[PDB]
Design a protein around this ligand. Structure first.
Ligand code: SF4
Ligand code: SF4
Ligand code: SF4
Ligand SMILES: [Ca+2]
Ligand SMILES: [Ca+2]
Ligand SMILES: [Ca+2]
Ligand SMILES: [Ca+2]
Ligand SMILES: [Cl-]
Ligand SMILES: [Cl-]
Ligand SMILES: [Cl-]
Ligand SMILES: [Cl-]
Ligand SMILES: [Cl-]
Ligand SMILES: [Cl-]
Lengths: 630, 629
């Protein structure tokens, strides 16, 4: 009768417990919202000044046509869209900015240090920083200074990655969307969306495209590249996923958020002899560290830390009654966790001055003394195990194995296994390019995205991934979408025979990989751009000429909008499972889902049905294959 | 039905607009009927696709939290902070463009260093050497240091000297000291994103830190660098209101905010070739008029007649005499594109930052600025040939006004009341003297745009008139200054007609009107400078002086950023239009109560201007008693 809440049995079990406990969840608050405002849902409501609030008609020819200022529905909708990109870009901007500042404070006998010297030497080449006969920390600081300039330089040209084809750069230049400093483009969009500024849908949407580029090729890239320098480049690693990872007799410390420095220090803190003994003093087996959302992906990729769950599972993790400490930093942390943690012994600890949540324990993460600060927070979670009500604990016995760490460096290393020593070249993406041109693999898709109560949890993610791998399309995943697959069991070597098509199953067996490749967090989507870029450069074509696609089956965050925008602007078609608020703007719908193709060689596709989406992705990929002659 | 405006010229053309069958901002306001109450109270959130969400502004009843679990106070505080971030961004790009122009100055170039003295003083603030060096070498170094304040990630930002050290340490202690301009905008846009900040007090403090990068930096730099290249304003005469348009002349109206284009269109209007072209088409000459901030910037430095303010822009086209309406960015109603189709007027858009569909687009080349301005102005001149003199109607109503009261000019004027054998010269001591003596009960700043929720110019005039009667010297900027220019308060004659005993006496001695026009809103930085200078001269903080700010009819997000930095700077601010904060009880308490305990000043929302004037006078007397003056 009522639509299912989720496809995961562990999620469905804890949802029943939440009802019996009397607590409210995101699914319950969705029902409370009832019918959602159509004006806001169509994007035709404007609040960019105090002359309104204005609400024009989404159906042209009837109702109120213009806003008080004169803005038409297309103007209102295009500005509303722009601001989402600018907000999404800002979330990834501060993320990478913080990583770069950490790189600037690295020392040989310090809490934060350079782990991957080889990666730093390569990154230093792109930023024009010398490496010959110099201290790795002196290079790291000069690189950090050059990287930080990309955020607010007002003169000169910005440094872009080598994987970005020159054809794509020239296309942006001629279109007028070449990126500038990161914070500069955010201000540019915010200024033009102000009352009495831009009133042209095409120009506004182009401003968002320019802004979104500073996220994917600058904010996220540097965030990913510098994280690999300081914490290590990820490689194929095993781990367990789903809420079944929590242990009843151990202290459970769940890390949620996005910033990787705090989670890297809580991992090291879990290995301090004093803290391991304090856990035993309280009556625990040990310290069971778990992750959720990006911060969890960033730790499972590098240290194989177990994943508790994705975005909409964050409330149900507390409902298990086994989370002693829930340490959060920034982004995608539902404020409900403060009210929910009151009904349990769980301690909700906020650490970033960027994300303060009312009625929550606030323990600021001292970046000057990071390891000491991490130990102080972890100690509080350990001591809280004393207040655990073991009789009311209920951790569903449902976990799944998964393989991740599939960075571009790791994928290239694995592809070397299928290269002949006497013929083929080494450490290049050629094996992947060869399989795509031949036609063994119909194409390569990137399923990324969040969880939305408008879609059954994980339903569209699994249906979409399944359908693509069945049609010989290798799938790469990141963020909550990657976790959704890890929970189902698609991130396993044995998933190739079970779900992959004829060609993909052959490639999986030869290269020895699962049919779905976990490439990391949403910031790690820059690795997908890097991979697709290398394939394009190796074949001497632009990214728009390859049979590639991006999918966001379930998405909410303004970050997903910026991600989609920079993916389409980079030349990769993107399918959206959740419809953005553009319905009321006919010109905006035409631009996003049609005219855009003429500007960047790619377009948006809105499809809520995942079965129809895979049909469209395959047909579109084939169209691009026929044009290229492959 | 309520009156649409108090100005007779405006009411006359509103009748013509009806007869011509054209739409105006007032018509579209009526069409919006009962505007939404969730958006009005600020309890509607669209920061993620899980929404839209709408909680109840009335605690206890209706939906309590959003889908993510965000309470009303969070939703309201995030919505308020985004208004500040947007307002700050608008001024940021304005000043940034000015700093880039300062970096491209040349001895034999279109953009030059007109005020060398000001640049030398500004160089001291940025720690740039000014001894035995080319003025353009100093200008480029000052421009580079100014540009750093927009995106420096390491080190501290440079703030102007007028800012008291007490105020700086107070911001530091509160955690709202300013970082780079664009960096702070990113910080607000980030913390407002789903799953980030969910504390009203923290969010409102983040917005205050962001707003400070607008007043003491972008707006301050924008004003300072503009005075260097285009000249520092001094007392000048001009005429205001739509009566300034001439039926037998080429009427070129400059609307917008950017000053470089306007400055170049003025220089272009003197090109012999363009002067003769105006004669070839059969005109008396080139009648240059301005509107909104851009019109203020040109009227402050060149006395260019002011056609009107924000809600009069459509009515300027309705006269049927505007041959060319050249625009750039900020507050250029998009309605002008459709409205211009009913008349011969050529609506020209010149900025890639503000493209408007169905408008003639002539990009203003910043590499060849004078040649670019000449090419745009030529199109406006040639359009005179397409005028239909039978459908023209310019109200025979204009007003004389005096403006150009920069801090330098106010000080220069105050030196005439200083004995050659006692007080120092070029200081604000005479103004602090009258304020401490009690002759001037205080000093209020009336700034702001125009909103259909309020009768056009009604609150501006009633507030200004009421403050000057109660011996409170009034300083004005933007549409509020233009409103006063049209009424006739920016005249020396207005002191005897509308000012109190003390203020009328001071006006007679200093030889000034009772209301001083200090420029555009980027020129509100002059108000901060002036108040800051008085605070430093008296060895106190800005929150200790009997000063206040008023926004009787605001609407722009810039106005929210202005108000926020004015309160954060220590000056109490009154709002004539209620912002979208009603639905957040904690947010209301923070802005209108706890803020006083954080920065020594708070917000006051009052729609009735007569009540607002009483509240301002009482609050000033309260601060005077605490100081013993
Ligand atoms: S503010 Fe807009 S989106 Fe929100 S409830 Fe009102 S009309 Fe709908
Ligand atoms: S900018 Fe225009 S559409 Fe938006 S609230 Fe203001 S008058 Fe209405
Ligand atoms: S921020 Fe919260 S209340 Fe707003 S749309 Fe998102 S989930 Fe809903
Ligand atoms: Ca890079
Ligand atoms: Ca393995
Ligand atoms: Ca701490
Ligand atoms: Ca100065
Ligand atoms: Cl390669
Ligand atoms: Cl009327
Ligand atoms: Cl019209
Ligand atoms: Cl006409
Ligand atoms: Cl002084
Ligand atoms: Cl009157």
């Amino acid at each position: 009768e009522e639509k299912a809440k989720s496809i995961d049995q562990a999620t469905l079990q804890l949802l029943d417990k939440a009802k019996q406990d009397g607590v409210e969840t995101v699914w319950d608050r969705k029902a409370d919202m009832k019918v959602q405002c159509g004006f806001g849902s169509a994007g035709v409501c404007c609040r960019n000044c105090s002359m309104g609030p204005c609400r024009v008609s989404p159906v042209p020819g009837k109702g109120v046509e213009r806003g008080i200022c004169g803005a038409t529905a297309d103007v209102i909708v295009s500005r509303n869209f722009a601001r989402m990109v600018a907000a999404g870009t800002a979330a990834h901007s501060d993320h990478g900015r913080s990583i770069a500042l950490s790189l600037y404070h690295t020392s040989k006998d310090g809490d934060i240090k350079v782990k991957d010297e080889n990666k730093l030497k390569e990154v230093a080449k792109s930023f024009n920083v010398e490496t010959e006969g110099r201290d790795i920390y002196d290079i790291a600081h000069d690189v950090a200074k050059e990287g930080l300039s990309n955020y607010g330089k007002q003169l000169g040209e910005v440094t872009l990655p080598p994987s970005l084809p020159e054809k794509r750069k020239e296309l942006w230049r001629k279109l007028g969307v070449y990126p500038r400093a990161v914070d500069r483009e955010i201000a540019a969009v915010m200024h033009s969306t102000h009352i009495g500024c831009n009133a042209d849908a095409e120009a506004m949407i182009k401003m968002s495209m320019r802004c979104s580029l500073t996220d994917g090729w600058m904010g996220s890239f540097m965030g990913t590249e510098f994280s690999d320098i300081m914490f290590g480049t990820p490689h194929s690693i095993d781990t367990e996923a789903n809420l079944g990872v929590l242990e009843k007799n151990s202290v459970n410390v769940v890390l949620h958020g996005h910033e990787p420095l705090l989670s890297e220090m809580v991992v090291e803190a879990a290995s301090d002899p004093e803290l391991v003994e304090l856990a035993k003093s309280v009556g625990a087996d040990g310290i069971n560290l778990c992750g959720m959302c990006c911060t969890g992906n960033e730790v499972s990729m590098r240290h194989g830390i177990k994943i508790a769950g994705n975005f909409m599972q964050q409330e149900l993790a507390v409902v298990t009654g086994a989370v002693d400490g829930l340490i959060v930093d920034v982004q995608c942390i539902m404020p409900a966790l403060a009210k929910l943690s009151k009904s349990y012994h769980t301690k909700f600890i906020t650490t970033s001055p960027k994300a303060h949540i009312t009625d929550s324990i606030y323990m600021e993460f001292d970046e000057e003394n990071p390891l000491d600060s991490a130990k102080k927070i972890l100690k509080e979670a350990i001591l809280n195990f004393k207040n655990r009500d073991q009789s009311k604990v209920m951790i569903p016995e449902l976990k799944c194995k998964a393989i991740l760490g599939y960075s571009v460096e790791e994928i290239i290393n694995k592809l070397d296994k299928v290269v002949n020593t006497q013929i083929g070249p080494m450490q290049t993406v050629k094996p992947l390019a060869d399989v795509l041109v031949s036609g063994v693999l119909r194409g390569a898709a990137a399923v990324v995205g969040c969880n939305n109560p408008k879609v059954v949890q994980d339903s569209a993610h699994i249906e979409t991934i399944k359908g693509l791998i069945k049609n010989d399309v290798i799938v790469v995943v990141t963020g909550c979408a990657a976790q959704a697959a890890a929970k189902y069991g698609l991130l396993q070597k044995e998933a190739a025979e079970k779900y992959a098509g004829p060609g993909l199953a052959t490639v999986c067996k030869l290269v020895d990989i699962p049919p779905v490749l976990h490439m990391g967090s949403c910031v790690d989507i820059s690795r997908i751009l890097d991979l697709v870029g290398r394939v394009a450069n190796l074949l001497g074509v632009d990214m728009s000429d390859l049979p590639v696609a991006g999918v966001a089956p379930e998405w909410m965050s303004e970050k997903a909008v910026a991600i989609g925008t920079y993916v389409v602007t980079s030349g990769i078609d993107t399918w959206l499972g959740v419809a953005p608020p553009v319905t009321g703007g006919p010109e905006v719908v035409d631009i996003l889902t049609n005219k855009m193709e003429d500007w960047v060689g790619a377009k948006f596709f809105i499809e809520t049905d995942p079965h129809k989406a895979v049909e469209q992705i395959v047909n579109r990929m084939n169209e691009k294959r026929k044009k290229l002659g492959i």
